[PDB]
């Protein structure tokens, strides 16, 4: 109510106040949660607010011990139904470095990455100890957010009932309890680039890219991508598809997680639609760059492309098998 | 859902959408009520939104068949500051014209109009038929908001849990179901002047004064009073005690509805403290002017003051007698 009055008055919360707010929401009646989420969304976000809420959400999560990991994500998925490039990007990145992909419920309350990974044969809820074995054996695991954030249990039905976007759509990608050192975070509108970048700074990420490509929460293979790079301060620049060494190409629509899975798998084995391949590769390139395995985006695409083939399909089947053990 | 998304996007609702919003609120779960009230407060409400909400509230209320009636009110500061001039003004105005005073829709009503009128011996809970009969034979009745606004009953426990100001701390004086032709509405902040005046415009009031005097939702007998007059469009002017024909005097605080009623009753009978008498009279003059009883504020004060004395205390007795029968 005090924090609610401050928000309703248009005042931005401090990092500490936002950390407190998560713990208040955690134990609040639905009426108060609804009020906080609608008011907060009407006001808008600062980086300090996103980071405080996200840090409190990590601290309340099921604990993970996965070492130094990378993640790639979007606050949506969002917009059109295109293939799930953050999932494909995370799988390609595991050829190079440890990945713990956080999943990351959509506005429908379902995780698009969780549906795609299930279609690729994963059991998507794994224990913390299964997750550690997955990373140690394959460099990859999937952390399904509803399973790792029991504190959100009273919040989920409120988010469902309100139907509007809320702060939880933005902090989802910031709330990975593995504490990723490296992150790609796509955002669904350009006004979120600066607060999300500042929040990653507040959270101590070693290197991150916050991207907004052709109006979507991903790197575009077709038009310009706005980028904020975090790690030496915050740097702003714009990428074009030519910076990755591809010709511009428009992504093609997708109707179901099953189709999304099949098209991603075909790319991973070195085949697939050229439009899917180049869309996946520019996003994989950004993940390799953010995790320091590539020095620039042209090299990141070149290295990601060389990893596709039979070995990548073999990695995928052992990830699937290990997740069901 | 749709109206909530419009509000949290910062878009102002049309009159007809604000009408729908009220009818959506009254049948909504607390979670959605809480989100709607907090988001609209964060955005800020407009005159058009206040009017649509208020018209839907009037249309949902218990039906009244009073005549052409007048009302005087405050939005509201504190339940302990000054004596309740709007109740005194309403009683005095009934010597000249039909008055249906609308009670306060906020949970406080501490030294509110309802408390003061009971401390003056009225039964404030009258059925629609006693109300008509009271008006026909004394020119005065009082509309108890909790009993005339059933649709508010789900809303009230949400307002209590939120503990913030909402649009309902403001909409009350615009929501008189007897559709007053004449109104004085004090507002507690200068920023309420324009939207409340606009709202009265949209709602078709024949003549109204929206007033803010010396920082309070009332006419000041001490300092300047900002006035918006609604009728021929909207006219703006500033009054001073000189415009009522009195020397400036500072109104003084009171502690309880009982002391408020005793100090008002002494004025009504022709005595009382000079500070209370001239405070009541400048507000009574505003209501005589808004009602077309008096042509200007000097005359309104003159006419109000000559109605005080034994006959006024006898009118109060008859009002109280009839309200109990």
For residues A126 and A25, membership in a common domain is answered with: no
Torsion angle in degrees (nearest 10) through CA of A198, A200, A205, A210: -100
Rounded to whole angstroms, how far apart are CA atoms B248 and B221? Answer: 6
Strand, helix or coil for residue A216: strand
Q: Where are the alpha helices (DSSP H) in B10-127?
A: 15-26, 30-43, 47-60, 85-93, 113-119
Phi and psi at B132, nearest 5°, equal -55, -50
For residues B270 and B159, membership in a common domain is answered with: no
Q: Which residues of A40-56 are buried (b: 16+ CB within 10 A; e: fewer)?
A: bbbbbbbbbbbbbbbbb
Bin B249: left if φ > 0, else alpha if -120 < ψ < 50, else beta.
beta
Residue from B4, B22, B62 nearest B167 by CA: B22
Domain residue limits at B241: 67-144+177-325
Q: Where are the alpha helices (DSSP H) in A206-273?
A: 257-268
User: Pick from A157, A176, A195: which residue ends a domain?
Assistant: A176
What 8-state DSSP symbol labels residue B207? E
HSE at residue B43, side-chain half, CA atoms within 13 A, is 25
Phi and psi at A73, nearest 5°, equal -165, 170
Place of tokens 């609308």: B102
Query: Given A8, A10, A162, which is nearest B4 (Cβ)?
Result: A162
Rounded to whole angstroms, how far apart are CA atoms A102 and B314? Answer: 77
For residues B97 and B169, membership in a common domain is answered with: no
Q: Give contacts of B32 with chain A, Cβ < 8 Å.
A: 34, 161-162
CB spacing of A42 vs B7 below 8 angstroms: yes
Rounded to whole angstroms, how far apart are CA atoms A193 and A209? Answer: 10
Task: Return the H-helix or E-strand segment holding A116.
Answer: helix A112-119
Q: What is the CA radius of gyration of chain A?
A: 19
Place of tokens 């590539």: A294
The experimental method behind these coordinates is X-ray
CA–CA distances in Å: residue A187 to residues A37, A228, A276, B184, B296: 19, 11, 21, 50, 61
Which of A3, A6, A8, A10 is the best substitution to test chain B (most B C-beta atoms within 10 A)? A8
For residues A73 and A158, membership in a common domain is answered with: no
For residues B269 and B300, membership in a common domain is answered with: yes
Beta bridge partners of B74: B186
Q: Which residues of A carry a binding-site annotation for anthranilate?
A: 74, 104, 159
CA–CA distances in Å: residue B35 to residues A87, A168, B24, B121, B209: 34, 15, 12, 40, 33
Task: Return the H-helix or E-strand segment holding B234.
Answer: strand B233-239
Q: Are B306 and B293 in contact (CB under 8 A)?
A: no
CA–CA distances in Å: residue A257 to residues A84, A93, A115, A263, B288: 8, 21, 6, 10, 71
Rounded to whole angstroms, how far apart are CA atoms B165 and B76? Answer: 11
CB spacing of A162 vs B31 below 8 angstroms: yes
User: Pick from B153, B176, B199: which residue ends a domain?
Assistant: B176
Strand, helix or coil for residue A292: coil
* Counted domains in chain A: 2
Q: Which residues of A carry a binding-site annotation?
A: 74, 77-78, 82, 84-87, 101-109, 113, 159, 217-218
State this model's resolution in angstroms: 1.9
Burial of B173 (0-12, 13-18, 19+ CB in 10 A): buried
Annotated ligand binding at B218? The verdict is yes
Q: Are A225 and A190 in contact (CB under 8 A)?
A: no
CA–CA distances in Å: residue B19 to residues A109, B14, B16: 30, 9, 5
3-state SS of B43-64 is HCCCHHHHHHHHHHHHHHCCCC
Q: Are B281 and B83 in contact (CB under 8 A)?
A: no
Annotated ligand binding at B113? The verdict is yes
Q: How many CB atoms lie within 10 A of CB B220?
A: 25
Q: Give contacts of B161 with chain A, Cβ < 8 Å.
A: 29, 31-32
CB spacing of B10 vs A38 below 8 angstroms: no
Q: Give contacts of A11 with chain B, Cβ < 8 Å.
A: none
Q: Give contacts of A35 with chain B, Cβ < 8 Å.
A: 34-35, 37-38, 162, 164
The angle that helices A15-26 and A47-60 make with each other, rounded to 10 degrees, is 40
Tokens representing B193?
A: 């002047």
For residues B106 and B214, membership in a common domain is answered with: yes
CB spacing of B161 vs A10 below 8 angstroms: no
Using the Cβ of B38 and the Cβ atoms of chain A, whether some distance falls under 8 Å is answered with yes
CA–CA distances in Å: residue B61 to residues A122, B57, B140, B149, B307: 58, 6, 19, 5, 33
Using the Cβ of A158 and the Cβ atoms of chain B, whether some distance falls under 8 Å is answered with yes
CB spacing of B38 vs A163 below 8 angstroms: no
Q: How many CB atoms lie within 10 A of CB B324?
A: 11
Chain A to chain B Cβ contacts (< 8 Å): 86
CA–CA distances in Å: residue B106 to residues A107, B34, B72, B144: 36, 16, 16, 11
Using the Cβ of A35 and the Cβ atoms of chain B, whether some distance falls under 8 Å is answered with yes
Rounded to whole angstroms, how far apart are CA atoms B34 and B17? Answer: 18
Residue from A7, A16, A20 nearest B164 by CA: A7
Residue A171 is part of a domain; what is its CATH number?
Answer: 1.20.970.10
Task: Return the H-helix or E-strand segment holding A119.
Answer: helix A112-119
Residue A87 makes CB contacts below 8 A (sequence gap 6+) with A101, A112, A113, A116, A117, A264
Tokens representing B241?
A: 């005690």
Question: Rounded to a whole number, what is the distance in Å from the CA of A292 to chain B's nearest CA?
Answer: 38
Query: Given A5, A29, A38, which is nearest B164 (Cβ)?
Result: A5
Rounded to whole angstroms, how far apart are CA atoms B34 and B114? Answer: 27
For residues B10 and B124, membership in a common domain is answered with: no
Tokens representing A114?
A: 């969780």
Rounded to whole angstroms, how far apart are CA atoms A85 and A115? Answer: 13
> Integer distance in angstroms from the first to the last C-alpha of chain A?
47
Rounded to whole angstroms, how far apart are CA atoms B200 and B204? Answer: 6
- CA A2 to chain centroid, in Å, comes to 32
Burial of A220 (0-12, 13-18, 19+ CB in 10 A): buried
Query: Given A8, A161, A164, which is nearest B164 (Cβ)?
Result: A8
Q: Are B211 and B286 in contact (CB under 8 A)?
A: yes
For residues A256 and A322, membership in a common domain is answered with: yes
Beta bridge partners of A185: A73, A210
E strands, chain A, are: 70-74, 99-103, 140-144, 182-186, 207-213, 225-230, 234-239
- CA A318 to chain centroid, in Å, comes to 23
Rounded to whole angstroms, how far apart are CA atoms B196 and A3? Answer: 28
Beta bridge partners of A234: A230
For residues B140 and B158, membership in a common domain is answered with: no
CB spacing of B32 vs A1 below 8 angstroms: no
For residues B168 and B294, membership in a common domain is answered with: no
Using the Cβ of A42 and the Cβ atoms of chain B, whether some distance falls under 8 Å is answered with yes
Strand, helix or coil for residue A70: strand
CB spacing of A33 vs B29 below 8 angstroms: no
For residues A234 and A278, membership in a common domain is answered with: yes
Annotated ligand binding at B23? The verdict is no
Q: How many CB atoms lie within 10 A of CB A223?
A: 12
Rounded to whole angstroms, how far apart are CA atoms A154 and A60? Answer: 14
Q: Are A224 and A234 in contact (CB under 8 A)?
A: no
**How many residues appear in chain A?**
325
Q: Are A78 and A251 in contact (CB under 8 A)?
A: no
Tokens representing A282?
A: 């520019």
Rounded to whole angstroms, how far apart are CA atoms B58 and B179? Answer: 8
Rounded to whole angstroms, how far apart are CA atoms A226 and B136? Answer: 72
The angle that helices A30-43 and A155-162 make with each other, rounded to 10 degrees, is 60
Question: Rounded to a whole number, what is the distance in Å from the CA of B4 to chain A's nearest CA?
Answer: 7
CB spacing of A162 vs B35 below 8 angstroms: yes
Which of B24, B30, B32, B39 is the best substitution to test chain A (most A C-beta atoms within 10 A)? B39
Helix/strand/coil percentages in chain B, nearest 5: 50, 10, 35
Q: Give contacts of B36 with chain A, Cβ < 8 Å.
A: 38
For residues B239 and B305, membership in a common domain is answered with: yes
Q: Which strand ranges, in their side-by-side order, compose the sheet holding A207-213?
A: A140-144, A99-103, A70-74, A182-186, A207-213, A225-230, A234-239
Residue B138 is part of a domain; what is its CATH number?
Answer: 3.40.1030.10
User: Pick from A128, A158, A176: which residue ends a domain?
Assistant: A176
Phi and psi at A107, nearest 5°, equal -65, -25
Q: Which residues of A carry a binding-site annotation for 5-phospho-alpha-D-ribose 1-diphosphate?
A: 74, 77-78, 82, 84-87, 101-109, 113
CA–CA distances in Å: residue A219 to residues A103, A184, A212, A245, A280: 19, 10, 7, 14, 9
Which of B4, B38, B43, B158 is the best substitution to test chain A (most A C-beta atoms within 10 A)? B38
């Amino acid at each position: 109510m005090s924090l609610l009055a401050k928000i309703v008055d248009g005042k931005n919360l401090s990092f500490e106040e936002a950390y407190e707010l998560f713990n208040e929401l955690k134990g609040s009646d639905g009426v108060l949660i609804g009020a906080y989420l609608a008011a907060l969304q009407t006001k808008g976000y600062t980086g300090e607010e996103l980071a405080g809420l996200a840090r409190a959400m990590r601290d309340s999560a099921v604990k993970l011990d996965l070492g130094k990991v990378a993640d790639t994500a979007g606050t949506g998925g969002d917009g059109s139904s295109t293939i799930n490039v953050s999932t494909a990007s995370a799988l390609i990145l595991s050829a190079f470095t440890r990945v713990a992909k956080h999943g990351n419920v959509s506005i429908t309350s379902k995780s698009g990455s969780a549906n795609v990974l299930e279609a690729l044969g994963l059991n998507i809820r794994v224990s913390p100890e299964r997750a550690r074995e997955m990373v140690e054996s394959t460099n990859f695991t999937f952390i399904f957010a509803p399973a790792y954030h029991p504190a959100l249990r009273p919040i989920m039905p409120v988010r469902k009932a309100l139907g509007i976007k809320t702060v939880f759509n933005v902090i989802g990608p910031l709330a990975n309890p593995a504490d990723p050192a490296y992150q790609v975070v796509g955002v669904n509108s350009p006004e979120l680039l600066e607060p999300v970048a500042e929040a990653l700074e507040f959270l101590g990420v070693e290197r991150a890219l916050v991207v907004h490509g052709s109006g979507m929460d991903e790197v575009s293979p077709h038009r310009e991508t706005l980028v904020l790079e975090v790690g030496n301060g915050v740097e702003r620049y714009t990428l074009s598809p030519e910076d990755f060494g591809i010709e511009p190409v428009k992504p093609l629509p997708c109707s179901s997680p099953e189709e999304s899975a099949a098209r991603i798998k075909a790319v991973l084995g070195g085949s697939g639609r050229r439009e899917d391949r180049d869309f996946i590769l520019v996003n994989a390139s950004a993940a390799l760059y953010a995790s320091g395995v590539a020095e620039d985006f042209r090299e990141g695409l070149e290295m990601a492309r060389e990893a596709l083939g039979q070995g990548m399909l073999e990695k995928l089947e052992e990830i699937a098998c290990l997740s069901k053990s």
